Amino acid sequence: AECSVDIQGNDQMQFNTNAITVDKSCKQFTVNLSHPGNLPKNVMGHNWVLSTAADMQGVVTDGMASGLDKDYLKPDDSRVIAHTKLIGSGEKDSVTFDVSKLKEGEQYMFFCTFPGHSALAKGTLTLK
Amino acid sequence: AECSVDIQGNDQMQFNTNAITVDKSCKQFTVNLSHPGNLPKNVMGHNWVLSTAADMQGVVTDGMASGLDKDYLKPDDSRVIAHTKLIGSGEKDSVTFDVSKLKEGEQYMFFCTFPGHSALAKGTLTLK
Amino acid sequence: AECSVDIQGNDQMQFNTNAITVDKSCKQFTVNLSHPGNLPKNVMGHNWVLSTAADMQGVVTDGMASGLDKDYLKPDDSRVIAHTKLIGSGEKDSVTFDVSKLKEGEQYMFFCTFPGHSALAKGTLTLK
Amino acid sequence: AECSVDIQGNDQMQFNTNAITVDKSCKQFTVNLSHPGNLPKNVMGHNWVLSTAADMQGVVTDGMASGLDKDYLKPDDSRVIAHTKLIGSGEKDSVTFDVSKLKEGEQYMFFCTFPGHSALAKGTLTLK
Ligand SMILES: [Cu+2]
Ligand SMILES: [Cu+2]
Ligand SMILES: [Cu+2]
Ligand SMILES: [Cu+2]
Domain ranges of chain B: 1-128
* Residues of chain A contacting D11 with CB distance shorter than 8 Å: 115-116
B40 alpha carbon – ligand 4 mean position (Å): 33
Chains that touch A (3 or more CB pairs under 8 A): B, C, D
User: D81 near D53, Cβ under 8 Å?
Assistant: no
For this PDB entry, the determination method is X-ray
Which run of H or of E encompasses B65?
A: helix B56-66
3-state per-residue secondary structure call for A16-65: CCCEEEECCCCCEEEEEEECCCCCCHHHHCECCEEEECCCHHHHHHHHHH
To the nearest whole Å, the CA of C16 is away from the closest chain D CA by 6
CA dihedral D36, D59, D63, A61 (to 10 degrees): 40
Going through D12-127 in order, the beta strands assigned E by DSSP cover: 19-22, 28-34, 49-52, 82-83, 92-98, 108-111, 122-127
Task: Give the number of other Cβ atoms within 10 Å of residue C25's Cβ.
Answer: 7
* Interchain CB contact of B124 with D (< 8 Å): yes
Closest ligand to A121 CA?
Answer: 1
Alpha-carbon dihedral sign for residues B38, B42, B44, B48: positive
The number of the ligand nearest the C-alpha atom of C119 reads 3
CB contacts under 8 A, D 62-121 vs C, are 119-120
Domain B1-128 superfamily per CATH:
Cupredoxins -  blue copper proteins (2.60.40.420)
Sheet harboring B108-111: ordered strands across?
B19-22, B122-127, B108-111, B49-52, B82-83
Centre of ligand 3 to C-alpha C123, Å, is: 13
B neighbours by CB contacts (3+ pairs under 8 Å): A, C, D
CA distance B33 to B15: 10
Reported as type and span, the H/E element at residue A8 is strand A4-8
If you measure from the C-alpha of residue B87 to the centroid of ligand 2, how many angstroms do you get, rounded to a whole number?
A: 9
- Beta-bridged to residue A15, according to DSSP, are A9
